[PDB]
Structures are given as structure tokens and as C-alpha cells.
Amino acid sequence: GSEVEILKALLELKKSTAELKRATASLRAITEELKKNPSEDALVEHNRAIVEHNAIIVENNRIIAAVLMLIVVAVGMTQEIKKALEELVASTAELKRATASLRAITEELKKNPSEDALVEHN
Amino acid sequence: RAIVEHNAIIVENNRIIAAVLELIVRALNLTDAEVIKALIELRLSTLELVAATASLREITEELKKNPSEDALVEHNRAIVEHNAIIVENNRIIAAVLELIVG
């Protein structure tokens, strides 16, 4: 379950990091090459839009991974919860047996109020 | 030419505003260290603005005398740098007004 989902989240962080590094490299290549001749308006404006789009995508990937890590941590407790439930089920069944026993004792004690029945009640 | 006239007007306008701000600060007898520092920053930015303006006028005149693609792109760059300086000068003026009003 979470063993693979988390490995994929780590792969995502690796890829969004590489994207950030490359987007930053183009950000700078753009500033240095385009300031040489501002008349190349389409090239500088298109590349700046590209850089902003990548920066947003990187930030979104970070947030998405941050949320999915909370889902993953909830998932990783599956076996601990399963064992807690098995214990709760066994406890419920034992409580039921004790209740049925007490009911039978109550009926026996009222029908035949022997001292032994009072001892069994306690 | 119209852009150069506009920048010369901005420079005169900001000089006048800085002067009126000094008159306001003196008239209100303000002592706040933040306003005094802001006025110092304003004075320095007005010196930078005037020098940049003179440089822009000289560049425009050189472009007019010998127009070319390289001179025109250099002139446009000079304009972008000048506008950045004007923006900084206006930021400082705004900070001074904020301190006076608030």
C-alpha cells in the first residue's frame, strides 16, 4: 500500500525539483540574453510567461505532495488499526458473554435465592 | 520626444513634491525618526533621479542626431532604467506621505 505511494511521492519531489532548477536556469538565461536587445519582445514575454507557469506548477506539486503525505500517514496505520479492532471485537464478545451469564444468574437468584447464587452474582 | 518631455515633467513634479513634503514636516514640527530617515532617502533618490534624467536627455539627443537600430535599443533601455528610478522615487514619496498621514 503506502510503501509504493510514498516512493512515488519521493519520485515526484525529485522531478519537481529538477523542473525548478531548469525553470530557474531559463529564467536567468532569459534575463541575460533578452536584455541585450529588448526589441525581441515576443521571445522575452513568452519565456517570462513560461517561467511563471513553471514556478506555479512547482509550488502546486509541493502542496499536493504535502497533502498526500497526510493521506499516506493515515494509510500506514492500517495494521495497527486492524489489530486494535480485533481486540475490540474480542472484548465486545466477552462482554456479551458476561452479560448473558449475569442475566441467567439474575433469573436463577430470583427464582431460587440461594446464598451461592448471591456469591455468583458478585 | 513626448516621452522625454514627460519624464522631465515628472522630475520637476517630484522635486516640487519633495519640497512641499519638507515644508509639511517642518510646519507640523514632526520629530519621528522614521520620517526624518524617509526624507533623507527622498533627497538621495531625487539626486539619483536628476542625474538619470540628464543622462536620458543626452541619450535622446544622441539618438536624434544619429538614429539607428542600436542607438534606438540603447535609448529604450535607458528609458526602462529611468522608469525604474522614477518608480523608486515614487515609492519613497509614498512612504513619506504614509508616515505624515499615519
Features:
122 residues; 89% helix; 2 chains; 4 helices; mainly alpha; part of a larger assembly; 0% strand
Radius of gyration of chain A: 34 Å
* Count of helix runs of chain A: 4
User: What string, H for helix and E for strand, traces the elements of chain A in order?
Assistant: HHHH
Name the quaternary structure. Answer: part of a larger assembly
Distance between the termini of chain A: 49 Å
* β-sheet strand percentage of chain A: under 5%
Notes on the structure:
This is part of a larger assembly, with 2 copies of chain A. Chain A is an all-alpha fold. Helix content of chain A is 89%, strand content 0%. Chain A contains 4 helices and no strands. The radius of gyration of chain A is 34 Å and the shape is rod-shaped. The relative contact order of chain A is 0.09. The A-B interface holds A 35, 37-39 and B 69, 73, 76-77, 80.
Brief summary:
This is part of a larger assembly, with two copies of chain A. Chain A has 122 residues and is an all-alpha fold. Chain A contains four helices and no strands.
Write the layout of secondary structure elements.
This is part of a larger assembly, with two copies of chain A.
Chain A (H helix, E strand, L loop, with lengths): L1 H33 L6 H35 L2 H34 L3 H7 L1
Helix pairs in contact in A: 1-2, 3-4
PDB class: de novo protein
Keywords: designed, DE novo protein
Entry title: DpHF7 filament
